[PDB]
Design a protein around this ligand. Structure first.
Ligand SMILES: Nc1nc2c(ncn2[C@@H]2O[C@H](COP(=O)(O)OP(=O)(O)O)[C@@H](O)[C@H]2O)c(=O)[nH]1
Ligand SMILES: [Mg+2]
Length: 168
């Protein structure tokens, strides 16, 4: 049974926890403590392959965790999430990409740029901005809404496909 070890990163409030729970539990969580970091596991079928997902929902807290360390070290792909109504969160993305490059000592890490909250009308980052940024990195860009499930499987599955390419 293939396992994929994914990590969800991004600024506070972008929806990292909502997207992870929406994937795992198929419901949209209104409020979830911003300082809570946890791992989730679900067996799924991606493209006809049954596999295990093992997902760390980061909170970027400073107290030490040894789980945090192993997933950064052993994690195989990363979701870099910003919100489309949050210009500062899109500006924060570079910091997170550079941190992942450092942990993997590599410019080629499986990674997907996710622009969350696409159910909102007050959009300050347009698709081209985000598409230009993902092309710069050579990684996919996927629009998500944790609230209605739009793109949620696509974001997590596309990353797994990025992991598959790397493993070849
Ligand atoms: N409208 C909308 N709100 C969202 C979406 N995802 C998350 N939120 C809301 O944004 C806030 C932060 O979400 P949370 O999952 O705690 O973000 P985190 O800090 O990245 O873990 C919460 O109030 C969520 O209800 C979304 O797709 N659409
Ligand atoms: Mg959270």
């Amino acid at each position: 049974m293939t396992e994929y070890k994914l990590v969800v990163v991004g600024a506070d409030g972008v929806g990292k926890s909502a997207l992870t729970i929406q994937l795992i539990q198929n419901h949209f969580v209104d409020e979830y403590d911003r300082t809570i970091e946890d791992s989730y596991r679900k067996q799924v079928v991606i493209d006809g392959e049954t596999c295990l997902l093992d997902i760390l929902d980061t909170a970027g807290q400073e107290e030490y965790s040894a789980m945090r360390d192993q997933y950064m070290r052993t994690g195989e792909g990363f979701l870099c999430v910003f919100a489309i109504n949050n210009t500062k969160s899109f500006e924060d993305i570079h910091h997170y990409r550079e941190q992942i490059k450092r942990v993997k000592d590599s410019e080629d890490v499986p990674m997907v740029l996710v622009g969350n909250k696409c159910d909102l009308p007050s959009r300050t980052v347009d698709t081209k901005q985000a598409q230009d940024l993902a092309r710069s990195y050579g990684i996919p860009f996927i629009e998500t809404s944790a609230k209605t499930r739009q793109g949620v499987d696509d974001a997590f599955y596309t990353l797994v496909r990025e992991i598959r390419k790397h493993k070849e």
